């Protein structure tokens, strides 16, 4: 907390949706193609879940390359409305032009929405499915073709994580108050709060999705990491450093999804510092929790497996 710009991007993206609908009335080339372009991205994202399966990532790249060429003659927009920090022209960058086709920003936004929904709908029940999606997000947004002024458009995706999983960004709350459930991202279907199981399922998929995008290794690639592992480190630290009185099960669920299946990658990046961190996340933090639950237990179970595998002892 308390609050920042990532919400402002969410509003501008909502205003972009209306803009594309208005153009579709006057612009026939945009109406002919925009709908099919949207669907083929969602279909390709959904198929990522179910080894040399590279045909679904290319279909998404080809559509974004087509939207960047802007054959549909879409209006141009200022990308500064969709990034946290206003960007200046960068030396050697592939695209320093101040405006971009509105169809491109829009389909990039659909790609981000598609990944968020996959984290929510599939990774919530089967956390394994978040990793192939995260690979696709990092692969596409890092393509030089899609870098605006030397940096990716990842801020369109991160702005959505801020809405549906604020705990990753330091937000806290009591699950007992309505002001707290809002600050924790507890969703509302038809006015009333969703069940506690649907909430924790959302948190599980989003927690696993965050690790999928934040724990990618790019040193072998010629591309720059759009969301390097420092953001995984910062996200974990904001959660585990929560004072005990303010810990919630929402935090424990996200933290479990952040760690489970990503211990090896976390250790490869940060080695002895990852062990110290996993000790804080899987031993100290659960002990600090004010009430036990299946979420706290799950952390303690992971603590034992890692204490056996790593010894969780550097001293």
């Amino acid at each position: 907390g308390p609050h920042m710009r990532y919400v402002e991007i969410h509003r501008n993206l909502k205003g972009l949706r209306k803009y594309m609908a208005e153009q579709a009335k006057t612009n026939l080339k945009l109406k002919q193609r925009m709908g099919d372009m949207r669907r083929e991205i969602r279909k390709s994202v959904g198929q990522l879940t179910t080894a040399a399966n590279k045909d679904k990532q290319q279909k998404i790249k080809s559509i974004l390359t087509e939207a960047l060429s802007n054959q549909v003659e879409s209006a141009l927009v200022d990308p500064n409305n969709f990034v946290v920090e206003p960007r200046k022209p960068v030396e050697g960058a592939t695209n320093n032009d101040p405006l971009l086709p509105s169809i491109f920003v829009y389909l990039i936004n659909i790609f981000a929405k598609a990944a968020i929904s996959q984290f929510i709908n599939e990774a919530g029940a089967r956390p394994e499915t978040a990793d192939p999606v995260g690979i696709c997000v990092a692969a596409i947004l890092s393509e030089p073709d899609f870098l605006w002024r030397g940096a990716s458009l990842i801020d369109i995706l991160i702005a959505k994580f801020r809405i549906v999983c604020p705990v990753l960004f330091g937000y806290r709350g009591s699950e007992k108050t309505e002001q707290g459930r809002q600050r924790l991202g507890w969703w509302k279907e038809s006015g009333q709060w969703i069940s506690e199981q649907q909430h924790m399922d959302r948190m599980t998929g989003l927690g696993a999705g965050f690790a999928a995008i934040s724990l990618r290794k790019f040193a072998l690639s010629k591309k720059q990491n759009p969301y390097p592992p420092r953001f995984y480190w910062m996200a974990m630290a904001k959660i585990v450093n929560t004072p005990p009185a303010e810990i919630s099960n929402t935090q424990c669920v996200v933290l479990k999804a952040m760690v489970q299946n990503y211990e090896a990658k976390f250790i490869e990046f940060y080695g002895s510092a990852a062990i110290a961190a996993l000790r804080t996340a899987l031993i100290d933090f659960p002990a600090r929790a004010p009430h036990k639950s299946a979420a706290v237990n799950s952390l303690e179970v992971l603590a034992q497996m890692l204490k056996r595998d790593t010894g969780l002892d550097l001293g």
């Binding site: 592992p229 420092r230 480190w233 910062m234 974990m236 630290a237 904001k238 585990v240 450093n241 990046f269 940060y270 080695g271 002895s272 510092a273 990852a274 110290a276 961190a277 000790r279 804080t280 996340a281 100290d284 550097l314 001293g315």
Partner: peptide, 21 residues
């Protein structure tokens, strides 16, 4: 001391600090 006493640092470590001794 090898462990985090006063909390997990929000700033990630330097590469050399993560080396195995």
């Amino acid at each position: 001391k090898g462990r985090f006493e006063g909390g997990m640092p929000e700033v990630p470590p330097r590469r050399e600090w993560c080396v195995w001794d």
